């Protein structure tokens, strides 16, 4: 009774090892729940070859997982919602307040003082509230894209931040996209 | 320190047990056959071979439908499925049809011989046959051994032929690949003497081990109605370990 | 001969123990710590596809692997930290009297001694010190980048030296980086 | 079947990487790209519950 | 290791020198078909010493 129930205990231990080895060592487990985990969206025309559970790559590191794609026939362009992170895409520090002091440094500077509101107080205090609620490091004008993995791998989403200076909230639509690019389309862009 | 002492006593009896089964094989094959020995070999080819024909032909089809359905799902991403007819007939001819058709022969016709010679040992038919003067190794055991070495390499060919024809059904006629590039992809990459003959020599070494084990376990039983049934699982386990064990040794030699 | 039932019960269990460690050595759950390993860092922008336990090559030879990848969302860049191996990248006492010397004979050179020659004594006594100190075989002229080795992917890091009279330190910042240049750029330039 | 699949990959890593001489890092990093968890490891477990 | 596309040898060890920054290969060659054995001296002695007694 003692050595029988023992040898079932050392049978569960070995199954626990070879379940962990399958997960973390040949499949990876980055999950559909990162820190917190909100959900933004975008709208493409050409999402071709994109199954559920893709990668969402920020600048070289996986930060999320694509949920599902749905095509509204009222406008014919495919939309997709995806989850992100908030410790990699936005501040949780006085960083949130650090970015206010450069935004009023270049825009309402000594040149463009009397080009916008030159005695702005509440418009300057609009900077104190618009930067603080649900802000991201992502600019207002990025461009998102379906990129391939290496040479002929799978397909995911990759965001390219850059240019301008305004920052967008959590749960919104990135209005700057471009779809995938198969062989046909390539020959097209060429000729 | 009794468990270590019991464990060492277990593998010493299993080592000695090999030496009895080796001396039993040298007494069977080193003898000119007795008068009437071909009439019993034709009958024992019916029990071992022909009764096993239904399971092998049906199960050989089900692997071919899987190999055509899995090989198409991988070869469509790289867009090269003129090699579908190659990888189906290369998985079967050198690897699966020698191995899987020995894992089904150990079950159906392997363990049935251990019940057949085993029930003759508990009901004293073997001891009664010897007092008449007839030697039971030459009379009973030896037509069963030679009907096992012949009937398995005739069955891996029927396994491999039905597996390719089944793989042609789901690849060409259901998923829609070209029929002419299916067959012409075979004759370029699949030789005869390197692939079909080396799939037959791999099954003669497998047919010797699944029959010499399955005969020795039913000859050296302990005569007991629940000692027979414990030697029918000893001969399915030991056959499936020597099939997969001599797989890697024969693969490294032939395709290294 | 009672021990013969005990000499075999010992060589069965032990041979069953030695087949468990060799399944925990060739699997990557026990072992493969690196001798005199030291983990440096650099900041990249595109490290897509770059897994943990990747490859790091200096000239052609693998020296270490990759473990850690950071995303710094205050300024969005990546940050990588990876272990090298001290047996091929760090000097010993026979070379230490040489690697103190090989810059020292170029410390007293036509170029670097005739370099406001009153500071030949300043470029001699203050250098050797830190020198013989903790210093690997990597120059300051070396840049690190991501490469791939082949038309299908591996994604490894590459360290391209440049020589010099100055060397880096254990666990530091390799301050010449470069990310990858695939998909987009590639296709675009290749029309 | 999990102990069968874990020992089979570790055994395949022994003759592939350590005896025939392929790269160890491209062996493992080729797995995490193409082998998902919920589509492959979970569907290999549901296939064995119907078999059990 | 190939001479014209014929396998003559295998590589055994790749080391890296820290000081000079030059890698190091160390291969083994079969000698049955790249060496001049006792028969094959007769082909080279009237050829390798024929370049020695040249006009140069």
The 3-class SS string of B4-25 reads: HHHHHHHHHHHHHHHHHHHHHH
Sheet holding C56-57, edge to edge: C39-42, C77-83, C62-72, C56-57, C156-160, C143-147
Resolution, Å (one decimal):
3.6
Q: Is the dihedral of CA C176, C177, C182, C185 positive or negative?
A: negative
Cα B74 from Cα C66, distance rounded (Å): 30
Q: How far is E2 from chain C (nearest CA, A)?
A: 20
Lookup: tokens for A142 = 């990025």
Task: Single out the residue of C12, D43, C102 nearest to residue B6, CA to CA.
Answer: C12
Query: Within 13 Å and on the Cβ side, how many CA atoms surround D5?
Result: 18
Residue of A nearest to C71 (CA): A88
Instruction: Report the gap between the CA of E25 and the closest CA in chain C (Å).
Output: 10
The separation between CA B112 and the C-alpha centre of its own chain, rounded to angstroms, equals 13
Q: Which residues, including other chains, have CB under 8 Å from residue C63's CB and lie 6 or more apart?
A: C56, C57, C84, C85, C88, C89, E16
Contact C8 B7 (CB under 8 A): yes
Structure method? cryo-EM
Tokens of E20: 């000079």
- Closest chain A CA to residue C148: A150
DSSP B114: H
C46, C148, C152: residue with CB nearest A59: C46
Residues 8-47 of chain E with CB under 8 A from chain C are 14-16, 18-19, 21-23
Give the CA-trace dihedral at B185, B188, B194, B198, to 10 degrees. Answer: 20
Closest CA to A54 of A149, A136, A144: A149
Cβ-count burial D9-44 (b if 16+ within 10 Å, e if not): bbeebbeebeeeeeebbbebbbebbeebbeeebeee
Q: Which residues 164-183 of chain C have a CB within 8 Å of chain E?
A: none
State whether residue D33 sits within 8 Å of chain C by CB: yes
How many Cα neighbours within 13 Å face the side chain of A59? 23
Kindly tell me the sign of the dihedral angle through the C-alpha atoms of D35, D38, D41, D43. negative
Q: Distance between CA atoms of A182 and A159, rounded to whole angstroms? A: 19
Spatial distance between the Cα atoms of B209 and C172, rounded to a whole number of angstroms: 63
Nearest CA in chain C to A188: C191
| Greatest extent of chain B over all pairs of C-alpha atoms, in Å | 71
Instruction: Report the C-alpha gap between B250 and B201 in whole angstroms.
Output: 9
Q: Which residues are paired to E11 by β-bridges? A: E27
**Closest Cα partner for B110 from B14, B228, B207?**
B207
- Are the C-beta atoms of residues A4 and A136 closer than 8 Å to each other? no
Task: Give the residue from C46, C41, C90 showing the smallest Cα distance to C68.
Answer: C41
Residue D25, CA distances (Å) to A61, C67, D31 in order:
19, 12, 10
Residue closest to A169 by CA, chosen among A190, A126, A140 = A140
CB of A29 less than 8 A from some CB of D: yes
CA of B48 vs chain C CAs: smallest distance (Å): 37
Closest chain B residue to C13, measured at CA: B4
C-chain residues near D25 (CB < 8 A): 51, 53-55, 62, 65, 154, 156
Q: Subunits that touch chain E (at least 3 Cβ pairs < 8 angstroms)?
A: C
Residue E23 and residue E14 in contact, taking contact as beta carbons nearer than 8 Å: yes
Contact B56, B101 (CB under 8 A): yes
Cβ atoms of C89 and C138 closer than 8 Å: yes
- d(C-alpha B170, C-alpha B177), whole Å: 10
Cβ-based neighbour number of residue A85 at 10 Å: 20
Q: Are A83 and A56 in contact (CB under 8 A)?
A: yes
Number of other residues whose CB lies within 10 A of the CB of residue A132: 12
Chain E residues whose CB is inside 8 A of the C102 CB are 19
Tell if the CB–CB gap between C90 and E16 is shorter than 8 Å: no
Q: Beta partners for C71?
A: C78
* Residue A43, helix vs strand vs coil: strand
Given its phi and psi angles, is residue B233 left (phi above 0), alpha (psi -120 to 50 degrees) or beta?
Answer: alpha
Please name the residue that has the structure tokens 């919104």.
A172
- What DSSP string runs through B118-134? HHHHHTTHHHHHHHHT-
Question: Could you give the CA distance from residue B174 to residue B163 in angstroms, rounded to a whole number?
Answer: 16
Cβ within 8 Å of residue D40, ≥6 positions away: A27
List of residues 6+ apart from C107 with CB closer than 8 A: C113, C123, C124, C127, C165
């Amino acid at each position: 009774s003692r050595t029988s129930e023992l040898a079932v205990g050392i049978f569960v231990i070995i199954f626990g090892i070879a379940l962990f080895f399958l997960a973390m060592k040949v499949s990876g487990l980055v999950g559909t729940n990162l820190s917190d985990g909100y959900t933004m969206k975008a709208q493409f025309d050409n999402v071709n070859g994109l199954k559920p559970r893709a990668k969402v790559t920020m600048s070289g590191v996986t930060i999320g997982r694509v949920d599902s794609i749905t095509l509204d026939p009222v406008t014919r362009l495919a939309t997709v919602t995806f989850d992100l992170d908030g410790k990699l895409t936005s501040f949780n520090a006085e960083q949130l307040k650090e970015v206010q002091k450069n935004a009023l440094d270049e825009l309402r500077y000594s040149s463009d003082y009397t080009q916008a509101t030159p005695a702005q107080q509440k418009t300057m205090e609009q900077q104190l509230i618009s930067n603080m609620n649900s802000i991201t490091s992502i600019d207002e004008d990025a461009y998102i894209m379906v990129a391939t993995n290496g040479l002929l791998g799978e397909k995911y989403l990759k965001i390219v931040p850059g240019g301008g200076l305004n920052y967008l909230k959590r749960g919104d639509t990135i209005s700057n996209t471009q779809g995938t690019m198969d062989l046909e389309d390539l020959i097209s862009k060429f000729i | 320190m009794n468990t270590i002492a019991w464990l060492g006593r277990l593998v010493i009896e299993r080592i000695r047990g090999i030496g009895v089964a080796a001396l039993m094989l040298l007494q069977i094959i080193f003898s000119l056959p007795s008068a009437g020995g071909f009439g019993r070999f034709v009958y024992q080819m019916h029990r071992v071979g022909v009764m096993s024909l239904l399971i092998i032909t049906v199960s050989g089809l089900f692997i071919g439908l899987v190999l055509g359905l899995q090989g198409y799902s991988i070869l469509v991403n790289v867009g090269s499925e003129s090699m579908l007819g190659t990888m189906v007939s290369l998985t079967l001819l050198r690897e699966l049809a020698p191995v899987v058709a020995a894992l089904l022969f150990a079950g159906r016709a392997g363990s049935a011989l251990t019940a057949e010679i085993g029930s003759m040992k508990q009901s004293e038919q073997l001891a009664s046959m010897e007092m008449i003067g007839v030697d039971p190794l030459k009379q009973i055991v030896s037509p069963r051994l030679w009907a096992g070495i012949v009937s398995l390499p005739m069955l891996t060919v029927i396994f491999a032929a039905i597996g390719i024809v089944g793989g042609k059904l789901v690849g060409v006629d259901f998923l829609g690949v070209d029929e002419g590039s299916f067959w012409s992809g075979m004759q370029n990459n699949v030789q005869f003497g390197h692939d079909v003959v080396n799939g037959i020599i791999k099954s003669i070494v497998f047919a010797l081990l699944c029959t010499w084990i399955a005969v020795f376990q039913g000859y050296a039983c302990d005569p007991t109605p629940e000692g027979i049934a414990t030697a029918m699982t000893r001969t399915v386990v030991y056959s499936s370990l020597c099939v997969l064990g001599f797989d890697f040794v024969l693969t490294a030699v032939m395709f290294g």
